[PDB]
Amino acid sequence: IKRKLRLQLKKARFNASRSRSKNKCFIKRMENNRKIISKNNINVQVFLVR
């Protein structure tokens, strides 16, 4: 099988193998962060997670 195609295919399969549950957790976190940022003049605690 040709190397160009198999590299494309392997990369596409890795990309597509993401879990919707994890995506939903990330979406929930993003929504929470945007809601907090929408505020103004409050003390906020920032954790680094990535």
Added chain:
RNA sequence: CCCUGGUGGUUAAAGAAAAGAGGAAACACCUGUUAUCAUUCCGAACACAGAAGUUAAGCUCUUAUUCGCUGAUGGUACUGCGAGUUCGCGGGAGAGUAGGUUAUUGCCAGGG
């Protein structure tokens, strides 16, 4: 203060064309080349000497926006970033369209 003439600032056509209104003052057209001046020839422009006449033109004002110029709100193109992917967040045209536009203003002189 206002009209007119001259001189600045504020730059969005503060643009040209067509039609109408005036001209007291001011301005312009207009008179003569003969005096200094100018033209690669020509008082046309300019230069000089003056006021007989006029709104015709330039100019000012009023006009349909006829040409131009300017321009929405949305939408789209495009773009930053993202463990949401033809998506999530942020910014947002050009063009087109509803429209709008023939300025405004500081201070010198003449007199209404």
